[PDB]
Amino acid sequence: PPRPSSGELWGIHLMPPRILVECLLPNGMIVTLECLREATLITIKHELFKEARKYPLHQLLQDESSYIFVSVTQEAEREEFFDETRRLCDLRLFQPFLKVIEPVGNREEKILNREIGFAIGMPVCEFDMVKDPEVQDFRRNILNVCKEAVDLRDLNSPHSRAMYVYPPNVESSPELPKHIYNKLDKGQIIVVIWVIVSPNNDKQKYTLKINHDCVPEQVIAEAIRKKTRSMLLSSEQLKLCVLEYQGKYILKVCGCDEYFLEKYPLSQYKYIRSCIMLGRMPNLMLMAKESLYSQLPMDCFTMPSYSSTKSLWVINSALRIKILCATYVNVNIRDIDKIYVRTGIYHGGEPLCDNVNTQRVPCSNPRWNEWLNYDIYIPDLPRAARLCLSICSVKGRKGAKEEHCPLAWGNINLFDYTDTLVSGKMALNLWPVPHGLEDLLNPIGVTGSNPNKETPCLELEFDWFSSVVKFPDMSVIEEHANWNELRENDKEQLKAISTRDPLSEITEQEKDFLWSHRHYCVTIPEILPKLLLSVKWNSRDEVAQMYCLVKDWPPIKPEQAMELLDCNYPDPMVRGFAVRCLEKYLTDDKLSQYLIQLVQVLKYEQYLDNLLVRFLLKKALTNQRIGHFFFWHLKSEMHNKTVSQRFGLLLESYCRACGMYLKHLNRQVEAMEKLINLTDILKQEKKDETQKVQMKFLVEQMRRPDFMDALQGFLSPLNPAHQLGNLRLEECRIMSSAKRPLWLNWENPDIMSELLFQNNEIIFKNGDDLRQDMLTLQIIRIMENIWQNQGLDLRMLPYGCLSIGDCVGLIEVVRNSHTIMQIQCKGGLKGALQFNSHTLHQWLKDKNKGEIYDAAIDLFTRSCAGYCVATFILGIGDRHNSNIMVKDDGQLFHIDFGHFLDHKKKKFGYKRERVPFVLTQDFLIVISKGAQECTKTREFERFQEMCYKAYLAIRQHANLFINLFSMMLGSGMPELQSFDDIAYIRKTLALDKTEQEALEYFMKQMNDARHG
Template sequence: MAPRPSSGELWGLHLMPPRILVDCCLPNGILVSLECLREAPLTSIKQQLFSEARKYPLYHLLQEESCYIFVGVTQEAEREEFYDETRRLCDLRLFHPILKVIEPLGNREEKILNREIGFAIGMPICEFELVKDPEVQDFRRNILSVCREAVEEREGGGAHTQALYVYPPNVESSAELPQHIYSKLDKGASASQLSLCLKCSVTHRWNEWLSYDIYLTDVPRSARLCLSICSVKGRKGAKEEHCPLAWGNINLFDYKDTLVSGKVALGLWPVPHGLEDLLNPIGVSGSNPNKVSMRAVCLCCRHYCVNIPESLPKLLLSVKWNSRDEVSQIYCLLKDWPLMQPESALELLDCNFPDPMVREFALRCLIQGLTDDKLSQYLLQLVQVLKYEMYLDNPLARFLIKKALTNQRIGHFFFWHLKSEMHNKTVSRRFGLLLEAFCRACGMYLKHLNRQVEAMDKLVNLTDTLKQEKKDETQKVRQKMLLNTYRHESAQAYLYTYRMLLQTNFSVFLCLRLEECRIMSSAKRPLWLNWENPDIMSELLFTNNEIIFKNGDDLRQDMLTLQIIKIMENIWQNQGLDLRMLPYGCLSIGDCVGLIEVVKNSHTIMQIQCKGGLKGALQFNSNTLHHWIRDKNKGEAYDRAIDLFTRSCAGYCVATFILGIGDRHNSNIMVKENGQLFHIDFGHFLDHKKKKFGYKRERVPFVLTQDFLIVISKGVQECTKTKEFERFQEMCYKAYLAIRQHASLFINLFSLLLGCGMPELQSFDDIAYLRKTLALEKNQQEALEYFTKQMNDAHHGGWTTKMDWIFHTIRHMPNEH
């Protein structure tokens, strides 16, 4: 039986054996078998090989050792030349332990660079060179000129600009609150024509013309032909069931603005799980379609709309894009249209606006008003909307890669946002080309990226091995043996002097503290990793840094939720409301692989309650949390801790309610020793809450139990009658109304990620939950009354939350750390 595919050190094996027999093919035709250590570098193997070759015939035909390199076949079925002879045998990812000795041909430096780039992006560069599509080759050539301009800008200013590139200041660029217009929330129908063109027989073939009632001169520049193949199942008289099989899209105009003609071979894509709406790929889009009368009003008032720049999305959704006259009028308006705020212009980059002129205008707004810190804040969405671009070479791609090459912090996350999507075949070519251009121009930083990629690959191999272990009495012994493998000095070379992916301060190098690392108890076997900071000034920053490495969980929803919480915090701070949120670091780096920052000196509510004995663990004593905070903070620190708890609790109550965060048991809420509360694990949002026998387990809009109210009221049992509780309510009301004023921003940010494939963000019906919680159909007073009712339901129904916590504690108390 053929060995199973593996991402490990050898085909079929996550970890290579300590000693392995390697077959080496010499240029003189002699085959030499060597017993090598898995951690042996290629230099050592070459010396051992040539020493052994002296014992074989035809040795005199060989040249000096330095004249040769090794070549092998990797697990991707690619022939790779190994120029870097410091690499270890276990790092080569060979298909089979066979190495061939050859004389290198061609440009050595170029081949080394191509190998490093291919390793960083996860696919060999030669795949791009074999693509015959002229758009790919033109893009590779043209994007390099953009990279060259960015590098000249980065290095042209001398030490000052280079320092700003490596150490970009992490400060707020402006203290002014942007002016937002709220009348653009409603979206309309996209210009599309959907009709049944023909019925296919069981022969699965047809050859006829498709006729559309549109003149060729009226075909919009952004038009595309969308095909969807589906099966129909149903008996006579019964309702037919449609099952999507595959889909594909063709741009009617190519990247040179030429109408596509002739025969086109279109490879279809499989339908993603749960996306049945792909049966109608060009159907109505938007959360609130425009009515015909509203469209007519917008078009009639288009010249007046110029005075309201943020009304542009509303106007564009009213345009008949299959009418040349209307499109030409809009193009004339765009030339004189005032620039919009960057947050408003983001909406013009989603799938509802494919027209190149519109997207180019949106990018001008971003270039004019988007600072580097704001760009970092919205980078997740901007990378994802690259999927909506019609062509490889587009203004947004040029803008992002230029920013990535002039700001190392942006470049770092730009690389990993693209890298994490490389498993998605629908975008791997587009993102791979961008990664290639970035890696060619990022200079010495490429080596650091490769160290990070290598470290992540090794950790994936380790967790894959751990997940296969059986739960028996020898499990801990075997896991300890596996960790001991990584204690060897050469084996952990990829983890030492390793730049932390979650840190924004890239100047700090960290060393792994193996004695503090452990394997967590959950089924995915996440790793708790602890790095120390060897800097002599580390006591002023941090002496160590802890992260959780997860392999098997999709962290994109966590990453999005934490991003939204961070934006909420910025909005509150700009309005003078400091709610002390704690959006810890989280980064998805691959297919269900990612990193989570561990917050120092923090404990789960369950851990704290268990310290209060059986009564605390079983929710009979609601004073345990307050007693714990009081014991950790003496004197004046106690008042500061209560104030910190009150502020952070108010912030998370509002945030979790608006976003519909679910699964809020007492292991997903944590408190720092200084009193700061925060939530973790955002695997369920937008009201996709867990159900039991068809009923939602969580029956309150957000968590506000008696435990929290006692802390807020400083231990008073009649919590709701205290001034502290009134102050807490006032904070919640102000926070809710502040976010409601920026509702369009949050709806836009979620809309831009509809194409990500997140399991709980796949349609506008999911985003409609935000409109509900923000009460956008009500005026401000009605919205405040609505939120007040939700808050009353939360603390009056707190007993239901505590019941859920009891069952969770009983089930998980032995495994809680």
């Protein structure tokens, strides 16, 4: 299993500066050797062999070069240490001992498998130990995607790999919303092109004014034009000179590793469009293509070492499953009367027949030996059919009203990955009931046995039909399937039905309605999710007809195909259509934006090898920016034992084929381990020490050589385009919060660091689940994209936040930003820890005095409006001066979104949000430019129109957000366990109402939350 902690030994966070290590020599002798905790294995083996001469049989030992060390790690792994450059404290040994052995196996191959096991957070040798054929099949067969993706990277060497390593970061649309166009000087943008003249870092600039839609070569050619004009070339020689040279240079962003390698218009590149929004002139670096191509290492992808049937439809039998017995259940016989197994045959969340329960048996004797007969004909079983069962306790001690409670649950696919109907006996280790689950069955929970075999084990037995039963091939289903009522009454209803949100109930009539008109549903493709829920999945005839309709279904937008990947649509053909829609329409930009949800929905796939995981692997292996966050999002949830094997097996394959980026990840993974371990100490053993003693301990520790090498020279996991050089240790500090956050500052090693940022500031926080803040900042970013397309310049600030593991992650620091409170702390105290309302505007008046004042108040009021609407729709309460920040430039933004969707108030049954926005007055003063009667201004009226306009815009896209939350159900986030948690968005967006009743509803809630 994975490590319990990040400590350098089992139960010890910090090795002593000197530690005694048991060395077991090959001649049988044992030598205790005092070693530095930071000592390399090279040094330690050398010192051992010096000491070994003092021991008997020392003339039997070969030279120290002929031996390597082996030991036991905290993951219970018997690891051979070939890469002897590693320091002692970073081996993460179980006990401080090393055995001296002759090395066995391939050096480079074993060193790789340790780097992978390190990056995954799980020893690779475990996958070699799983007897499961589906796992071994996944590990082998997935390499097709790896090799195929690697060939596509070496197809157009070296440009193709330059594209892989430094993909263009471009918007999905070259079109500028016209309010962005007018920020340009008649569509032209001024850019400063820099070139470094060797050797003195001599920086020469050529400032250009050019159209916003100029492609990089056109920008380059214009730079060459500016340079060469002074050299009296002939007019034609200049033409020939521009055409030849323009193709051989590239542009790079000053201060970071983002390059303009592709034919996009300059404004389509995200760095340029942002420069238009913020009004900053882009600083770019011109670079010869050979200079970049030399920096690109060759990605070596090596193939690893491990590289009579009856049809389902001929079975004339009903489905029956035998519940044999359970090993044990933890119930007190005095309080629980009896127990039973409750079963159901499900397709997704919908049951295919009546649920069947076993007879009741005594608690102490959980054995049933009972054949359960189900209301489904075996040929009518859909492919994603699943048995959902649980052991339920019943106590009738409250009267004639019995108590039923779930004890432990487990779900199983009735067909394995080989399209075979399950047969014979099977043992299913059950899962504990989730905290708060009162349902007797858990079909949305993971399907499959609990890897923890120390749990209640329920024995099942499936039927046997004298032969292996296989699901029919697609040709048979289609062939079997092949064997003007549409008035406007029906046409208007079909459109109204498709527009209803995914969480609206679809009545049994409407289910019948869409199915009868399934063919006109083709003429309205977005209705496919609604129609799919209307099929009789317990009828192969209707499913077959549905399969044929899907085979020719028009491709739908990506944001609608994602819904067909959540827990509601388990059928492989439905998902297959969904993945094909993504291959066709999902830009690498949008993929990055929805990368979290696409990783989450992997938990609902029936099998390890599927079309979605292959599409995601290929995309990750051909775009390193996608592949980076594909890694961490998979990585950050390896702690979750419900998927750790699936994600572990996947992370193995990505790491084996991602090329040289694995090395950069190893730097990041190890850099984080030092931070986790250090924070563990600060949070645990030194929890009672003062700020000073901890700060001393902090400065003491990072100064240690192992810490210096680990935490310097790596890529920011928040954004790998930022290089983290040396630590600016004077600026590193532990923050006052009791979770002991770590404010870290690095040097920017880019030669143009002074033009972008010479300091990279990151907050490392151990002890808080950041998945909420990740999702909120993701949602905030999408709301801004919508508002911009509809012409609403609401400046949000979705700063970087990345959960990297169990309640541990990173936050991008926003420079020149201060909480409202930090701004308020200027002239003294008012009341019980409270402050003055006018101080905020008074401060902002000083920061942006003169002509910038109107632009700053405008930026504030625009930025304030977006967060007001965003926090309302998402139900993020408790917004006050501590979690609202304002930049010196005037942009307001919210922080710390730990809990949303009204889950703090769910325990009370009172659904009425009336907390007064504490900072209503303070912000009104700014919007009103300092008026005494703030609410009477015309500017305030403009502010209200933005919020009304922004609110309806999001209401117009309610299906997208509902789907995004729906795709997150398997994450185990506390505020997101059922669709009922997601239903709060239905209330805030007033989807049961009309646009007029909704806006009035909004205006009401704002007034209920008005003056604070």
